[PDB]
Structure 1
Amino acid sequence: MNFPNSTNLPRNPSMADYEARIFTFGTWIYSVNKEQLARAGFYALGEGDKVKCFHCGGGLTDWKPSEDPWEQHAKWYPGCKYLLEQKGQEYINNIHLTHSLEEC
């Protein structure tokens, strides 16, 4: 609902460390893996399976077991500089092409 951060500077520097993000989940009952979420730069909000990216501030919810943290990060927050640093634009393109073709 707020604009996504597309700068090279994290919106939430307190959540810049993997272990800082890990602590936010607590006991995690959800179908998607908390360490996989923390690696894709997500931390838990404490409200269902709502996560936000530390860098772009981008929020996601309702994780199906088929949904991949990095993939969803690229789908919904393609301007994220953290995503670009970790995954590269070749990965990012692939994923975009795949979900723009998932539609048919």
Structure 2
Amino acid sequence: STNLPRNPSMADYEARIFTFGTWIYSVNKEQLARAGFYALGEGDKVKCFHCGGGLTDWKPSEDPWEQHAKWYPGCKYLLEQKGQEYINNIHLT
């Protein structure tokens, strides 16, 4: 299902934040890991443990939850943590 994570090995926040040990980019690693992302080890590429959606080319001080909702609104981890109202608002500008 979409209710199960694509990468269960990254389902723990502690595991995700660990992948950002070598993170030099201007996007907050705690916010990234909170939003479900872990680092792939190539540039600023990250992937969501649940939906598998990848993001790259981050702008400085960008909001990871906003980008998660912008590009991958069907993610069930995004839904659980942020709710449908938030996802809809992101797409209403």
Q: TM-score, normalised by structure 2?
A: 0.95
Whether contact under 8 Å (2:28, 2:61) holds in the other structure is no
Shift of 1:68: 0.9
Whether contact under 8 Å (2:68, 2:78) holds in the other structure is yes
Shift of 1:66: 4.5
Distance in 2 separating the partners of 1:51 and 1:17: 15
- Unpaired stretches in structure 1, ≥5 consecutive residues: 1-5, 99-104
Shift of 1:27: 2.3
Cα deviation digits, residues 10-56 of structure 1 (max 9, x gap): 00000000000011112211010111100000000000110000000
1:58 matched to 2:58: no
Cα deviation digits, residues 45-102 of structure 1 (max 9, x gap): 000110000000000001112421000000110110000000000111000111xxxx
Distance in 2 separating the partners of 1:68 and 1:25: 16
- Unpaired stretches in structure 2, ≥5 consecutive residues: none
How many residue pairs get aligned? The number is 93
Distance in 2 separating the partners of 1:91 and 1:79: 12
1:10 is aligned to 5
Q: TM-score, normalised by structure 1?
A: 0.86
Distance in 2 separating the partners of 1:15 and 1:59: 14
Sort the Cα spacing of 1:66 and 1:35 in 2 relative to 1 into closer, same or farther, 3 A: closer
Please state whether the residue corresponding to 1:43 is helix, strand or coil: strand
Please state whether the residue corresponding to 1:97 is helix, strand or coil: coil
Please state whether the residue corresponding to 1:49 is helix, strand or coil: coil
2:43 is aligned to 48
